[PDB]
Amino acid sequence: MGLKPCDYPDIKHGGLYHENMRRPYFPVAVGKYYSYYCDEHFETPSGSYWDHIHCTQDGWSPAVPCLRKCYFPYLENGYNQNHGRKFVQGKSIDVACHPGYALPKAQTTVTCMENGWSPTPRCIRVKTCSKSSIDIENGFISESQYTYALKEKAKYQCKLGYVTADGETSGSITCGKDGWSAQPTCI
Ligand SMILES: O=S(=O)(O)OC[C@H]1O[C@@](COS(=O)(=O)O)(O[C@H]2O[C@H](COS(=O)(=O)O)[C@@H](OS(=O)(=O)O)[C@H](OS(=O)(=O)O)[C@H]2OS(=O)(=O)O)[C@@H](OS(=O)(=O)O)[C@@H]1OS(=O)(=O)O
Ligand SMILES: [Cl-]
Ligand SMILES: [Cl-]
């Protein structure tokens, strides 16, 4: 009898051309295909603003007729190589922020979703702890960098014969939102 038929394609971020003429022939028989467009900021699988949707035995094809098009913005606090490039939905791009800045929080890539970039392509200043605020007697900070990013650890080594609170001859402390995890102890 009938391996039938397909209903009106509710095209997200797009629409069918000649909408008034084609409505109501629906439900539409299999094999029938219609030209459709995609709204601004969106594209067809072929990469154009218009294509053809086909009534398949398993529904409309393509299943996602209109994919988002993402525009890589300028990065004031990062290294720029893609400012102005366009990417189709599902694409992941590497993001290089300047030392001390990171993506939120903290991916190394932004992916183009249907709703736009995920996360937003912008480098935010990372919170830090200063080595100058550290205090240790009978040991020293064996690193030795001045600024530590959140969750980064500051290494310290005790003096000959002294031990930490583990009690080992060396340990570390962690940088947090509230400052250092604690004070190094070498006794
Ligand atoms: O990343 S952002 O939030 O800054 O948005 C970047 C995109 O802004 C556009 C349009 O975005 S849209 O509204 O989503 O389509 O234009 C806007 O930014 C550009 C400059 O891009 S840059 O990365 O910030 O430098 C401005 O051009 S200019 O002012 O720098 O010469 C647009 O001003 S104008 O409309 O062109 O007058 C500015 O428009 S708006 O003030 O944001 O309304 C895209 O640029 S566009 O595609 O040329 O319009 C940016 O995406 S892009 O991939 O960087 O171009
Ligand atoms: Cl930035
Ligand atoms: Cl010291």
Q: 3-state SS of the chain?
A: CCCCCECCCCCCCEEECCHHHHCCCCCECCCCEEEEEECCCEECCCCCCEEEEEEECCEEECCCCCEEEEECCCCCCEECCCCCCEEECCCEEECEECCCEECCCCCCEEEEECCEEECCCCCEECCEEEHHHCCCCCEECCCCCCEEECCCEEEEEECCCCCCCCCCCEEEEEEECCEECCCCCCC
Residue 105 belongs to domain with CATH number: 2.10.70.10
Strand partners of residue 173:
154
Atom 48, ligand 1: which residue's CA is nearest? 84
Other beta carbons less than 10 A from residue 25's beta carbon = 12
Calpha distance 96→20 (Å, rounded): 49
* Tokens at 85, concatenated: 């490039």
Quick check: 133 and 123 in contact, CB under 8 A? no
Count CA atoms closer than 13 A to 95's CA, side-chain side.
30
Calpha distance 129→136 (Å, rounded): 15
Q: Degrees (nearest 5) of the Cα angle 78, 79, 85?
A: 105
| 90 residue type, one letter | G
Residues 58 and 74 in one domain: no
Residues 61 and 1 in one domain: yes
Q: Degrees (nearest 5) of the Cα angle 123, 125, 129?
A: 145
Residues 112 and 157 in one domain: no
Residues 79 and 103 in one domain: yes
Ligand lying nearest the CA atom of residue 140: 3
- Which method resolved this structure? X-ray
Quick check: 65 and 45 in contact, CB under 8 A? yes
Residues 1 and 61 in one domain: yes
Strand partners of residue 128:
149
- Strands laid side by side in the 67-71 sheet: 42-43, 67-71, 86-88
The structure tokens 């031990």 sit at: 163
Quick check: 116 and 142 in contact, CB under 8 A? no
Q: Which atom of ligand 1 is nearest to the CA of 86?
A: 53
Atom 6, ligand 1: which residue's CA is nearest? 73
Q: Which range marks the domain in which residue 174 is found?
A: 127-187
Identify the CA nearest to 67 among candidates 7, 11, 6: 11
Handedness of CA 55, 58, 60, 65 (dihedral sign): negative
C-alpha distance from residue 114 to each of 35, 64, 65, 83, 179 (Å): 22, 10, 12, 20, 39
Calpha distance 23→44 (Å, rounded): 22
C-alpha distance from residue 17 to each of 2, 33, 75, 99, 118 (Å): 27, 12, 39, 50, 31
At what resolution in Å was this solved? 2.3
Q: Degrees (nearest 5) of the Cα angle 185, 186, 187?
A: 110
Q: Determine the distance separating the centroid of ligand 1 and the alpha carbon of 65, expressed in angstroms.
A: 26
* Tokens at 165, concatenated: 């609170």
Residues 92 and 151 in one domain: no
Atom 7, ligand 1: which residue's CA is nearest? 73
| 75 residue type, one letter | L
Residues 36 and 4 in one domain: yes
Q: Determine the distance separating the centroid of ligand 1 and the alpha carbon of 72, expressed in angstroms.
A: 10
Breaks (C-N over 2.5 A) in the chain follow: none
| Spacing of C-alpha 18 from chain mean position | 38
Q: Which atom of ligand 1 is nearest to the CA of 85?
A: 53
Quick check: 112 and 86 in contact, CB under 8 A? no
Quick check: 58 and 36 in contact, CB under 8 A? no
